[PDB]
Structure 1
């Protein structure tokens, strides 16, 4: 059952679409340097533009919503080397172009930015970003009252020497959602994919790598480990394979659970369920595949949308 598609309202290509916490809102960002937010009308089950606005001087590539317990906040990353934060002002008409106020700007990056992800709420307003400079940066809104008070918490050189050629480069972030697991996050930078963990010293250290990728990692996402003791992160590589890694900490162990080339071409998007019960993958073949785990913990394709 397909539903009535709709126009985003963007002129240039759209890079990311993201859901709010409740799944009733979506934020869109494209190259036309705009961020659009759609609302899912209760009555007429249709998606309808809540507000659109110009937000960056260059192409906006990444986007993300903060936990509802900190307000209505969106974050954006652009090729203009910045990350901007916005907060919805309910006292403005929708579509007015002025429904979301910039709360701040992060200019520390000296290279374009490809990704930005808020951290799990149980760690406060925190976030990460990664760009050409090959330097992952974490920021913290130390005082949850001042949603402008964004301090820089950490800086790590993912690539020792960022190659810097033919912008044939890719980077991705994904925090470990787990509430009852030590703070950590995954990062992909080209062929490599590495995991960081908070130490007793309050600093990030590299705790492992997800080996096997023979090309560019287009996407990666940590799955919600509700119920499980272990962690699972999936990656969609350019070599045309979905990979699912089981990470156990007894400090971290790394198993490869599955590999799937069903896409025959690059896997662009890899996404998870809210319960981490279903995993999605999309690619060149112009198809989306949904995967469930077997009783043996292998992964099986439960359906193919096209």
Structure 2
């Protein structure tokens, strides 16, 4: 496994795999989004297309279920999010390979993270800004991938900083989204009335929460969501749903001695990864007792 130049002139922020893990979409402070392709023949990655996406620094990215086309979404410090439908009948390395399906100017403050809701709910997406306001967009009509409406607009809290969020993958559980603002972590669920509500919180954080992601509850009903905190501790919670949610603290690991920056899940929720200051990436597997044990460690 050999690295490769992202090609970015300024520090890189997010890297997201498309559905079939064939491509990866980069984005950094150089205001450019880059999609890379994994060559079937040679095990090498090569730039599919780079292009100025936003005017300020870009920080988040996420693809949309191929059942809705090839739509990469992006958020930036320019206080606005942009969508991009890939143009199959184009060139590569050109810059005319992706178009602004639209632009979400509503956020009256710099955005930090945007993720597409699971496909079974439709073509929806959430995004959290610095104004501490959650915003849910969705092209009510899948045919015109250009007009997105404002579903919900909830406000988290004050702005005296780090953010991020992750939906609940599981297609067989009532819609819900977990958002984390600073030293907080709150779970939201859809109501009987079709409006969002606060279903529970993940207690225990002492510092800002660098990363949080929900896990694919494949084969199980109890949900699982991991936390990468600034204090240097990973946390795995077990949310069971009988107010009707129970939140359990399963594990907790300091193994990193620094700050947990990125915490990520397997595609079947079998493995969990944790990266931090100690420049190492640990992977975790679950026990029969459901406590988490690290299986391997990578470094630098």
TM-score range, shorter chain: over 0.9
Number of the residue aligned with 2:37: 39
Number of the residue aligned with 1:278: 271
Q: CA deviation at 1:149?
A: 1.2
The DSSP-based 3-state class of the residue aligned with 2:154 is: strand
Q: CA deviation at 1:288?
A: 0.1
Give the Cα–Cα distance (whole angstroms) in 2 for the partners of residues 220 and 4 of structure 1. 28
Give the Cα–Cα distance (whole angstroms) in 1 for the partners of residues 147 and 52 of structure 2. 23
Q: CA deviation at 1:160?
A: 5.0
Give the Cα–Cα distance (whole angstroms) in 2 for the partners of residues 94 and 228 of structure 1. 42
Q: CA deviation at 1:21?
A: 0.2
Structure 2 unaligned spans of 5+: none
Q: What TM-score do you get using the length of structure 2 for normalisation?
A: 0.98
- After superposing on structure 2, the runs of 4+ consecutive aligned residues of structure 1 that deviate more than 4 Å are none
Measured against aligned partners, the alpha-carbon deviations of 1:92-147 in whole angstroms (never above 9, x if no partner) come to: 11111110011000000011000000000001110000011000000011010111
The DSSP-based 3-state class of the residue aligned with 1:192 is: coil
Give the Cα–Cα distance (whole angstroms) in 2 for the partners of residues 88 and 140 of structure 1. 18
Q: CA deviation at 1:272?
A: 0.1
Measured against aligned partners, the alpha-carbon deviations of 1:206-227 in whole angstroms (never above 9, x if no partner) come to: 0000000000000000000000
Give the Cα–Cα distance (whole angstroms) in 1 for the partners of residues 53 and 84 of structure 2. 10
The DSSP-based 3-state class of the residue aligned with 1:95 is: coil
Q: CA deviation at 1:7?
A: 0.5
Q: What TM-score do you get using the length of structure 1 for normalisation?
A: 0.96
Give the Cα–Cα distance (whole angstroms) in 2 for the partners of residues 142 and 4 of structure 1. 43
Q: CA deviation at 1:44?
A: 1.2
Give the Cα–Cα distance (whole angstroms) in 2 for the partners of residues 44 and 254 of structure 1. 46
Give the Cα–Cα distance (whole angstroms) in 2 for the partners of residues 5 and 171 of structure 1. 28
Structure 1 unaligned spans of 5+: 162-168
Give the Cα–Cα distance (whole angstroms) in 2 for the partners of residues 37 and 271 of structure 1. 20
Q: Residues 1-306 of structure 1 correspond to what in structure 2 (within 5 A)?
A: 3-160=1-158, 169-250=161-242, 251-306=244-299
Q: CA deviation at 1:43?
A: 1.0
Measured against aligned partners, the alpha-carbon deviations of 1:46-75 in whole angstroms (never above 9, x if no partner) come to: 100000000100000000000000000000
Give the Cα–Cα distance (whole angstroms) in 2 for the partners of residues 111 and 261 of structure 1. 34
The DSSP-based 3-state class of the residue aligned with 1:122 is: helix
Give the Cα–Cα distance (whole angstroms) in 1 for the partners of residues 85 and 155 of structure 2. 30
The DSSP-based 3-state class of the residue aligned with 1:239 is: coil
Q: CA deviation at 1:148?
A: 0.6
Give the Cα–Cα distance (whole angstroms) in 2 for the partners of residues 238 and 74 of structure 1. 29
